[PDB]
Structure formats: C-alpha cells, structure tokens
Design an enzyme around this catalytic site. Structure first.
Site, PDB file in Angstrom:
ATOM      1  N   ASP A 113       3.270  -8.072  -6.501  1.00  8.78           N
ATOM      2  CA  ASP A 113       1.415  -8.821  -6.585  1.00  8.78           C
ATOM      3  C   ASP A 113       1.406  -8.574  -8.295  1.00  8.78           C
ATOM      4  OD1 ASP A 113       2.397 -10.862  -4.809  1.00  8.78           O
ATOM      5  OD2 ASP A 113       1.045  -9.436  -3.311  1.00  8.78           O
TER       6      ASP A 113
ATOM      7  N   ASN B  53      -7.019 -13.421  -8.239  1.00 10.29           N
ATOM      8  CA  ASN B  53      -7.417 -13.335  -6.447  1.00 10.29           C
ATOM      9  C   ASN B  53      -9.093 -13.589  -5.978  1.00 10.29           C
ATOM     10  OD1 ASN B  53      -4.631 -12.730  -5.829  1.00 10.29           O
ATOM     11  ND2 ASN B  53      -5.067 -10.535  -6.113  1.00 10.29           N
TER      12      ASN B  53
ATOM     13  N   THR C 219      -5.652 -12.807   1.156  1.00 13.42           N
ATOM     14  CA  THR C 219      -5.304 -12.705   2.218  1.00 13.42           C
ATOM     15  C   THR C 219      -5.108 -10.663   1.356  1.00 13.42           C
ATOM     16  OG1 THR C 219      -2.937 -13.236   0.282  1.00 13.42           O
ATOM     17  CG2 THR C 219      -3.727 -14.149   2.769  1.00 13.42           C
TER      18      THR C 219
ATOM     19  N   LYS D 124      -9.562 -10.259   2.794  1.00 13.38           N
ATOM     20  CA  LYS D 124      -8.891  -9.980   3.964  1.00 13.38           C
ATOM     21  C   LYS D 124      -9.432  -8.562   4.274  1.00 13.38           C
ATOM     22  CE  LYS D 124      -4.994  -9.734   7.029  1.00 13.38           C
ATOM     23  NZ  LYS D 124      -5.183  -7.995   7.241  1.00 13.38           N
TER      24      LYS D 124
HETATM   25  N1  LIG Z   1      -9.952  -1.807  -1.193  1.00 11.02           N
HETATM   26  C1  LIG Z   1      -9.262  -2.698  -1.163  1.00 11.02           C
HETATM   27  N2  LIG Z   1      -8.466  -3.522  -0.364  1.00 11.02           N
HETATM   28  C2  LIG Z   1      -7.435  -4.518  -0.135  1.00 11.02           C
HETATM   29  N3  LIG Z   1      -6.984  -4.462  -1.893  1.00 11.02           N
HETATM   30  C3  LIG Z   1      -7.633  -4.569  -2.640  1.00 11.02           C
HETATM   31  C4  LIG Z   1      -8.793  -3.514  -2.454  1.00 11.02           C
HETATM   32  N4  LIG Z   1      -8.765  -3.290  -3.591  1.00 11.02           N
HETATM   33  C5  LIG Z   1      -8.381  -4.146  -4.073  1.00 11.02           C
HETATM   34  N5  LIG Z   1      -7.238  -4.824  -4.088  1.00 11.02           N
HETATM   35  C6  LIG Z   1      -6.609  -5.190  -4.094  1.00 11.02           C
HETATM   36  O1  LIG Z   1      -5.841  -5.397  -5.714  1.00 11.02           O
HETATM   37  C7  LIG Z   1      -5.220  -6.334  -6.410  1.00 11.02           C
HETATM   38  C8  LIG Z   1      -4.403  -5.716  -7.622  1.00 11.02           C
HETATM   39  O2  LIG Z   1      -3.547  -5.221  -7.352  1.00 11.02           O
HETATM   40  C9  LIG Z   1      -2.325  -6.148  -7.857  1.00 11.02           C
HETATM   41  C10 LIG Z   1      -2.300  -7.062  -6.257  1.00 11.02           C
HETATM   42  C11 LIG Z   1      -2.163  -7.653  -5.608  1.00 11.02           C
HETATM   43  C12 LIG Z   1      -2.191  -8.489  -4.143  1.00 11.02           C
HETATM   44  N6  LIG Z   1      -2.702  -9.737  -4.205  1.00 11.02           N
HETATM   45  C13 LIG Z   1      -2.631 -10.150  -3.159  1.00 11.02           C
HETATM   46  C14 LIG Z   1      -2.589 -10.821  -2.411  1.00 11.02           C
HETATM   47  N7  LIG Z   1      -3.080 -12.008  -2.760  1.00 11.02           N
HETATM   48  N8  LIG Z   1      -2.446 -11.429  -0.854  1.00 11.02           N
HETATM   49  C15 LIG Z   1      -1.833 -10.657  -0.683  1.00 11.02           C
HETATM   50  N9  LIG Z   1      -1.770  -9.362  -1.426  1.00 11.02           N
HETATM   51  C16 LIG Z   1      -2.027  -9.104  -2.510  1.00 11.02           C
HETATM   52  N10 LIG Z   1      -1.484  -7.993  -3.057  1.00 11.02           N
HETATM   53  C17 LIG Z   1      -1.888  -6.576  -2.342  1.00 11.02           C
HETATM   54  O3  LIG Z   1      -2.590  -5.443  -2.819  1.00 11.02           O
HETATM   55  C18 LIG Z   1      -2.637  -4.779  -2.290  1.00 11.02           C
HETATM   56  C19 LIG Z   1      -2.579  -3.440  -3.139  1.00 11.02           C
HETATM   57  O4  LIG Z   1      -3.210  -4.264  -4.167  1.00 11.02           O
HETATM   58  C20 LIG Z   1      -0.548  -4.807  -2.419  1.00 11.02           C
HETATM   59  O5  LIG Z   1      -0.475  -5.045  -1.197  1.00 11.02           O
HETATM   60  C21 LIG Z   1      -0.590  -5.926  -3.117  1.00 11.02           C
HETATM   61  O6  LIG Z   1       0.472  -6.476  -3.505  1.00 11.02           O
HETATM   62  C22 LIG Z   1      -7.249  -6.313  -6.004  1.00 11.02           C
HETATM   63  O7  LIG Z   1      -6.899  -8.359  -7.589  1.00 11.02           O
HETATM   64  C23 LIG Z   1      -7.330  -6.756  -5.208  1.00 11.02           C
HETATM   65  O8  LIG Z   1      -7.106  -8.449  -4.988  1.00 11.02           O
END
Ligand SMILES: Nc1ncnc2c1ncn2[C@@H]1O[C@H](COCC#Cc2nc3c(N)ncnc3n2[C@@H]2O[C@H](CO)[C@@H](O)[C@H]2O)[C@@H](O)[C@H]1O
Ligand SMILES: Nc1ncnc2c1ncn2[C@@H]1O[C@H](COCC#Cc2nc3c(N)ncnc3n2[C@@H]2O[C@H](CO)[C@@H](O)[C@H]2O)[C@@H](O)[C@H]1O
Ligand SMILES: Nc1ncnc2c1ncn2[C@@H]1O[C@H](COCC#Cc2nc3c(N)ncnc3n2[C@@H]2O[C@H](CO)[C@@H](O)[C@H]2O)[C@@H](O)[C@H]1O
Ligand SMILES: Nc1ncnc2c1ncn2[C@@H]1O[C@H](COCC#Cc2nc3c(N)ncnc3n2[C@@H]2O[C@H](CO)[C@@H](O)[C@H]2O)[C@@H](O)[C@H]1O
Lengths: 258, 258, 258, 258
Positions: free
Chosen positions: D45, D116, D155, D159
């Site tokens: 992603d 996102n 998500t 989430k």
């Molecule tokens: N504390 C925190 N808890 C949760 N998420 C956090 C976070 N801090 C930042 N992020 C996130 O990290 C994004 C940037 O990294 C790339 C991506 C993605 C990413 N986008 C999505 C998405 N649309 N839906 C589901 N999973 C996602 N992923 C998964 O996000 C997981 C970890 O990044 C990996 O499983 C990716 O597969 C940033 O935009 C922010 O959404």
C-alpha cells in the site's frame, strides 16, 4: 484424598472423566462429591464456573483443577493428553480474589459470590441508578447496565466492555459501563474504575426498582430492590498448580497467538 | 520545620507565596529550599510535577502539599482562601506509588522516576517494539506509542487513552496503547494491562533504535536504545494531609461536577 | 392547511398546545389529526419519535415540527417562547433518510421504518448471528447485540456505542457492535460500518432463533426468525424549517455547551 | 496505450516488473512514465500511495492498478501469479473520493491531495486548536492531534483511532481525535465526525502556530500557520477494475480471515 470430577456432558469429556477415575482407582483416592478435597472440571470455562458455584460453601477446603477438552480456557488450563500425568502428581496452591454481591430488598438480604463478574441491567425499561462509592454519591448512570469484575474475570465480559486486564494477584474489582448516555444533562465518568479491598460500591435505583442481576452464568430478575452492594470478598478460590503457567502467558495464548 | 514554597510564576501565585512565608515567619519555621521537610506547590498540576522532580532525591524526607490557584488539580487540592488555615496546622502522611523507568543503551544505564506516567514514541519513523513481560514475549506493537502510568497518573494521559482509573492505594502500573495497528498480520492485545509489584515490562526495538521517551513533563530523544524497563518503584511520594479528601471524591469534582 | 398537535402529556406541554390551537383558530387552519399536512410535537425527542410513528403511513404528505418544552432535543428544536412566532410563519422542507427493517419468519414478512435506529438482542440466552453484506458472509457476531442507525440517529444509541456522528444529508446507515467477544476463536470487525444506499445487511441466526428486536422506542420479542434485513429506506421524513439551525450547531449545543 | 510500472524495489517486485514489461512488449503498449494512461504499482500500500502522489497532477487521465507482492493491500488487490492474465486484459473504471487540504500562512497558500488521510500534530509542545465547521465554532481541541480521512482511508490510521469504516462510494470525509483531554474545563465531542461534500472544516491555532502536518506518508513541519482547511476534493482517483472485488469483501479478507 477425596475428589470429584464434573464433565461438560459430551462424549469427549465423559470418557476422559471415566479414564481419570480408573487411574485414580490405582491410588489412595476416594471419589466423594459431597466433601471433596480436589475438584476437577473437564470441559470449558462455563463448565468450570458451574463447578465453582457447585461448591461455593466449601471454598477454603477445595483446590480446583480445570482440563480443557475444547479450546484453551482461562480457568481450564490443562490439555486432555496430559490427564494421566495429572493423576499421578495429584503441589502448591494459588489463590484468586472473588467479588461479593449483596442485594437488599424493601420490606431480606441475599448475598452472592462471583468468579467472573456481576452485572446489573434493567427489567425492560430504561436503566437509571445512582452510583455511591463509600457513602459518597459519585454519579447517576443512565445506560444499558454496569459490570463489576474480579481480576480473573477482567478477560471475560469486562474485556468486551473496554475494561483493563488485571493480574489476579491484585485484590481488587473493576467497574465498567455498558453504553452510558452522555450529553448536556447526563454525565458519567466513562472510564473503568478499579477499587481496592474494603471499598464498597453501592447502586441505588432512581425510579424503576426491578433489575436483571447476573452473577457469572446465572441471571435472575430481582424485584423491589433497594440497593446492590459490591466489594472484594474475603473468600478466595484456590487452584492446584503443578507447573508454571503465568497469567500473562495465558492471556497471550488466548488473545494473541497459540 | 524546614520548608520551601514553589510558585507557578504568575501574579496570583507569587503574592500568595509571599503571604504564606510571612505567616510562617510567625512560627518556628525555617525557609530552606536545599533540605526542606515540607514542600508547598502553589499553582497547578504541572507546577506540582515540577516540584516533585525538584526533590526526587529526598522523597522519604519530604511531605508535599499542593495549592491550586487556577482550577482544581489532582495533586494541588487546597484552595487559596484556605492558605492561612494551612499555615497554622503545619497531621498524617499518605503515600502514593511511583513508576521506575530504566533505559539501557548499546555500548551506560539511565533511571528515572515518574509521578504521572512514562511514554515511548518513535523518533519520526514508524514505531515498532516487542513487549516482554517477565522475560516472556507478549506481543509486537506497531502504532504511535505506549504509556505506562502510576495509579495517581491514571486520571492523566492514561485516561485519555482509554485506561482504567485506579485508586492510589493499589501498588501497580498500567500500560495503555496509542493507536495500535491491528489487521491480518499485526496483532496487539488492545486492552489496558495492569501490573503488580515486582512485574517487569520490557520494551525492545525491532528496527529503529531511536525513541522519544517522556517522563511526566520531560521528553528527551534517546539514541542507540537497547531496552526500556518499567516496574513499580520501591520509592513513594508522601503527602501531608490535614482533612479527608478521598480520591473518588476528587475524581468526581474534576470530571463529573464541582 | 390541515394540522395536528401532539403533547408530552404534562402540564407545560398541554397548555402550550391549547394556546397554539387558539392562535391557529385566528387563521385559515383546520385541526385534523386524520390527514394533517403539518404535525407539531410539543415535548421531547421521545414525544417526537411517537409522533413520527403515528403517521408513518403518510410521510410524503406531512412536514414535522418539534417544540422542546424540556431540554433541547435533536428533533424538537424550537423553544416554547417562540410558539406564537411559529404559528404566524406557518417555509422550506428538508428531508432526512430513514432505515427500513425487514423481519422474515420461518413458515409472513414484517417491515418497519426507523427514525433513530433498529437493534437486535437475544431472547435471554447468548446472541450469535452471521452478518451477511450483499449476499457475502462478512462475520459471525458473538456479543450482546447490534445497532443499525440512521444519520439523525447517530447522536442517539449509536453514539453511546462508539459510532461516528454523520450529517443527515448523507443517505446511509451505520452498524455498531454491543460488546462483541474477540479472542483466538471468535472474531468481529470491531469498528462501526457505514453503508450507502442499495446495500443490504442481513442478520441470520446460528442457533437460537428468538430475538428482541427494537425500532426506536418499540421493542418486541420475535420468534421463529429466519433473517433480519437492513437497508436505507426509499421513504424520507420531511421537516418544516423556518430558520437556519445547522446540524453541527445542534450537535454543539447538545454535547459541547449551550 | 501508454503505461508505466513502479516497484517496491526488492528482488520480488523488480523481476515481476520486468516480466510484465516483456509481456507488454508483445502488444500495442508504449512504456511512458511521463504521460501514462495506466499506472501499475507492484508492492504494498505504501508503494501504491507513492505511485498516486507521483502523478497527482494527471489524475483524470490515469487509471491505477495495484499488485501486492507482500501481503494483501487495500489498494494493491491483484496477486502476482495473476500478472500475465492482467497484461492480456489491459475494463471499467471506478472512482474513489479524495481529501483536499489547504494550509495558509501568516504574511502564500499551499494545497495538498490525500488518498488516505491528513493529520495535524504539535511541533513538540501541547496541541491546542479551535475547530470551525462552516464558519461556526464547534470546539476547542486539546490532545495529541486530529485525523481527517477519505473513505478508502478509513481502514488505515482512521481505523486505529476508533473511526468508522466507510464505503468508498460515499463522497465524504471523517474526523477522528487522537487522545483528547476531557475534564471539568476541557471538552471535545469525543466521537468521529463524518462530513459530506461542500462542508469545510477549519483548524485554527490558539497559541503555538507550528504544527507537524502529514498527508499520507509525507509529514512536514509547518511554521507560522494561520489555518488548516479540509474538504472533500473535486478530484477523484480512478482505478482499472477487471473483476468483482467488493470493498466489504476486501475488508473481510484484511481484518477477519483470508
Ligand atoms: N498508528 C497508525 N496506525 C495505523 N495506521 C497508521 C498509523 N500511522 C500511520 N498509519 C498509516 O500509515 C500510512 C502510510 O504507510 C503506508 C500505508 C498504508 C495503508 N493504507 C491502508 C489503507 N488504506 N487501508 C488499510 N491499510 C492500509 N495501510 C496499511 O497500513 C499499515 C501500516 O502503514 C500497513 O499494513 C499498510 O498496509 C498512513 O497514511 C496511515 O494511514
Ligand atoms: N457480551 C459478552 N462478551 C463477553 N463475554 C460475555 C459476554 N456476555 C457474557 N459473557 C461472559 O460469559 C460468561 C459465562 O459463560 C461462561 C464463561 C466464560 C469465560 N470466562 C472467561 C474468562 N474469565 N476469561 C476469558 N474468557 C472467559 N470466558 C469465555 O467467555 C466466552 C464466552 O462466554 C467463552 O470463550 C468463554 O470461554 C460470563 O460470566 C461473562 O463473563
Ligand atoms: N494528550 C494528552 N491527554 C491527556 N493528558 C496528557 C496528554 N498529553 C500529556 N498529558 C499529560 O500532561 C502531563 C504534563 O502536564 C502537567 C500535568 C498534569 C496533570 N496531571 C494530572 C493527573 N494526575 N490527573 C489529572 N489531571 C492531570 N493533569 C492535567 O493534565 C491536563 C493537561 O496536562 C491539565 O488539566 C492538568 O491539570 C503529562 O504528564 C500527561 O499526564
Ligand atoms: N443506552 C442507550 N444509550 C443511549 N441511547 C439510548 C440507549 N438506549 C436507548 N437509547 C435511545 O433511546 C431512544 C428512545 O427514547 C427516546 C429518544 C431519543 C433520542 N433521540 C436522539 C437523537 N436522535 N439524538 C440525540 N439524542 C436523542 N435522544 C435522546 O436520547 C436520550 C435517551 O433516550 C434522551 O436524551 C433523548 O433526548 C432510542 O431510540 C435510542 O436511540
């Protein structure tokens, strides 16, 4: 020593029970379900909770052991394949705190003992109670209900309601809310509360005085209720332990990975 | 006895400090900010936390008192209008548990003492640590950070992160998560964890080894970190109490209504 | 036009109703509670929900107005002192989406319309249902119940269960969980789900087929249930609006400060 | 058509990229990374989010496709073994909404586009902002930060912060809180807020005017900030879809079981 074995009732647990009795017949063991020294529960956590309430009048003379025939249970932490090794070794005792619940009626008290939790919900209408902590009015609760959990019960209903997980060496009880109303006029603390020994939490009705009160798996509709008192019980449940199975390890195996 | 007074620094707190010193000059009291027996904090909770860390090397010889010039604080629970009555009475001592934090570096240890909490966050990149409870691997945490709170700190950062409120007579510490990732591959417990005395929680890095580590109001970027150990400290903070102000009452006045 | 007025039934709301009828008698207005064009609700939100279900068969011919005699309500957003100014002006219409609930029995369908939400709970035993989204099995839910909310209902039961607040111009419905079980064997999404128009959420029983099903204030025990279908209704509730009172302002006044 | 392929950079993704280019060389396809019609992302992603921002100036001329070499991603929903079948078929387009962020400085605007979310946090000190919804002051936020999410971003960070999961056919944005303070003097809504098109959410500083502002994976420290405006963008991301892979199915496979 005197012992008894309770079963979940299915084919797996009944025949495991008969084989342990046969193994016990090769030692100085007397099967006695009236005054047992050892109570073995073969099944799940609900089977264990039933075994606990079966002998809640003789808790200080009984050491409980749980064997999980289905998945791993928090109270039944022995595998079936280790049953014969369990018969032979039958150690030290460990004790978990319990919750004492007192229900008073307008115009004879009734007390109960809980291993997981005690919950209060309305008889159908809206649920409104005043929450009194050590004779000091803390809040007026409007919502679906309240839950008071033991330490070992914090992984059960308590956990689903947002409560903290609490190591069972801490003599305490934890109160969680079930869907409280919070707006400009109604206000609750909204956080779980953890109480020590000798703290008394009282729930007092505001209008309706009929409540659905649960204690572990039992749930009875109580009428003409005036007060519901919670406090850490002076009684404790004693387990027979034969090897190191730490609480945090058991939490890991049940919720993280196994 | 020997005493000292710290102030928030604003006009209200400075002149209240000068008037108490004048009142103390009419008794057998010596103002000594090197080896005080009594430490009075005039201001807010942050002013109190500063006073605590000012004298963390002489905790067993000092009784703390807090006066809240602004709103009501959980540690500063005396009103300004009651200052002269406070001078005269200057009782029993009450003690709250503390959190000990140990930071080890690759290739000299550093220890800290916390009255509210200690938190760990990443140096900018993603935060990944393994959580080890008493040498047993519990989980691998991916998220924003983790928070370890004292009992009296459970109403502070801990409360905002979904943690339970814990009466300060319980010698314990509580770990809460800051925005953990949970999906098909990443998994955390997702519940606050409450640990008793002598339990050691260790945080170990997985890739990046630079972390922003906070202790109450202080926050320092630590580099080349190998481990962060948490445990209930053997040291305790002692308060001078002159009247009954129960913890649950203070929680009510701060969050419910006052 | 034809109109009617319903009252909370207390002294304040009844005499305010009689004075508005007298004021309406000075205009070309006919009091008709069989086929009204305007429905005025004097009381609270529960009084308004009753008025809505009173005339759910003629929603496209009726514009609702709510007057709050008690506190401020989300549907009753007119003060009593503004009643005479309301009579004179009696504008534009605004429409809020509604939730359609279909209950099928083994061996005659039954449909319902909700302004706040519809919830499903067990008949006493444990609650287990399979959740099917557009004929695709999404999850098996074990817990206390589920709640499906309209946009204007998101500030009601939905809000207490952790759901998001949703502006009523969005044609959607939101599903929240009530105390789901989550461990090594049981798994739910644990997040509120927001569905658009034409998405059908179906709840199917796993063992017990008796459920307590609520629609706003009504709650009926349904037996021999085979399926419960949720979808955004094609019908809408129409309000008579005379001035700007934005939804986010109304949320602010009800939960933040007023 | 003109196309390009970006890679995670590891051995698996680079050689899968070279084989698809070879397969594309057997058709009327021109590799052009300046003005592509099709953008294929091979990796995760985060690799997809990089590909999106690579070509955010030509969103209406580009259809994105994601191939997940690691685990399943929400944007990269094609398996590597299906790469040759993907080359041949290279259909309909589906569009997801986006979030527009405007940052104004005291004494030149700067706009950004998010797939996102966009988040705001303090530059080190405490984070205090006033939240303004359509020029109406809604609340004063004290906490760690705020997060504004697209539907497909619900998500992700959203989430983890307790936000609702929102189907991407809904043109909306969702605001979640990061550890808000709530007591007798500080008050926030505490619930996620879902906004429709044309609603503008503005964040205005109270004291400190330096903020850490993130947009997807990018995070920059902004100074002398006067306002941060959020609204559903008029631009949309277009995907090339070759088979039915519903959003709720993709949520199930990523969080429930796969
Ligand atoms: N504390 C925190 N808890 C949760 N998420 C956090 C976070 N801090 C930042 N992020 C996130 O990290 C994004 C940037 O990294 C790339 C991506 C993605 C990413 N986008 C999505 C998405 N649309 N839906 C589901 N999973 C996602 N992923 C998964 O996000 C997981 C970890 O990044 C990996 O499983 C990716 O597969 C940033 O935009 C922010 O959404
Ligand atoms: N909405 C709801 N969410 C969550 N839990 C709810 C609940 N409603 C009731 N309960 C619970 O059910 C108990 C009575 O049933 C026997 C037991 C146990 C039971 N006890 C424990 C325990 N101490 N720790 C962990 N898991 C437990 N379990 C597991 O609990 C799971 C389901 O019961 C099965 O995995 C059991 O293995 C009652 O005392 C109350 O704690
Ligand atoms: N996102 C975030 N949410 C919530 N709390 C966060 C936080 N980030 C940091 N903190 C906190 O800030 C502390 C340092 O500042 C001094 C203090 C205190 C402070 N201590 C307590 C306490 N023990 N109990 C209740 N309220 C407290 N307060 C109030 O805390 C409020 C704001 O600080 C003011 O009302 C203080 O009266 C730090 O140790 C951490 O506990
Ligand atoms: N545990 C529980 N937590 C939270 N809400 C629960 C609940 N159990 C049921 N409800 C609710 O009760 C509704 C039926 O009663 C009439 C109404 C309304 C009602 N509707 C709304 C609304 N749309 N928005 C805000 N407040 C509302 N209210 C207020 O709801 C408050 C209490 O009812 C009073 O302030 C009303 O002003 C039912 O449809 C369900 O939404």
């Amino acid at each position: 020593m005197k012992y008894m074995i309770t079963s979940k009732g299915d084919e797996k647990s009944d025949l495991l029970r008969l084989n342990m009795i046969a193994g016990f017949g090769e030692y100085d063991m007397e099967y006695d379900d009236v005054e047992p020294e050892i109570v073995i529960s073969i099944g799940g956590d609900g089977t264990f909770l039933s075994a606990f309430h079966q002998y809640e009048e003789r808790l200080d003379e009984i050491a409980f052991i749980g064997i999980h025939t289905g998945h791993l249970g928090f109270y039944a932490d022995w595998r079936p394949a280790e049953a014969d090794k369990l018969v032979k070794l039958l150690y030290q005792k460990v004790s978990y705190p319990l919750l004492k619940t007192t229900v008073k009626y307008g115009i004879k008290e009734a007390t109960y003992l809980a291993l997981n939790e005690s919950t209060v919900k309305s008889s159908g209408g809206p649920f409104v109670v005043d929450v009194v902590i050590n004779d000091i009015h803390f809040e007026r609760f409007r919502g679906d209900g309240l839950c008071m959990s033991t330490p070992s019960g914090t992984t059960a209903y308590n956990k689903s309601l947002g409560g903290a997980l609490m190591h069972p060496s801490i003599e305490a009880m934890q109160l969680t809310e079930m869907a409280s109303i919070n707006n400009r006029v109604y206000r609750t603390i909204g956080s779980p509360l953890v109480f020590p020994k000798h703290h008394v939490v009282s729930l007092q009705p505001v209008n309706d005085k009929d409540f659905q009160i649960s204690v572990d798996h039992l749930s009875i509709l109580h009428r003409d209720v005036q007060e519901i008192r919670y406090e850490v019980s002076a009684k404790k449940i004693h387990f027979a332990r034969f090897r190191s199975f730490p609480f945090w390890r058991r939490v890991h195996d049940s919720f993280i990975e196994d």
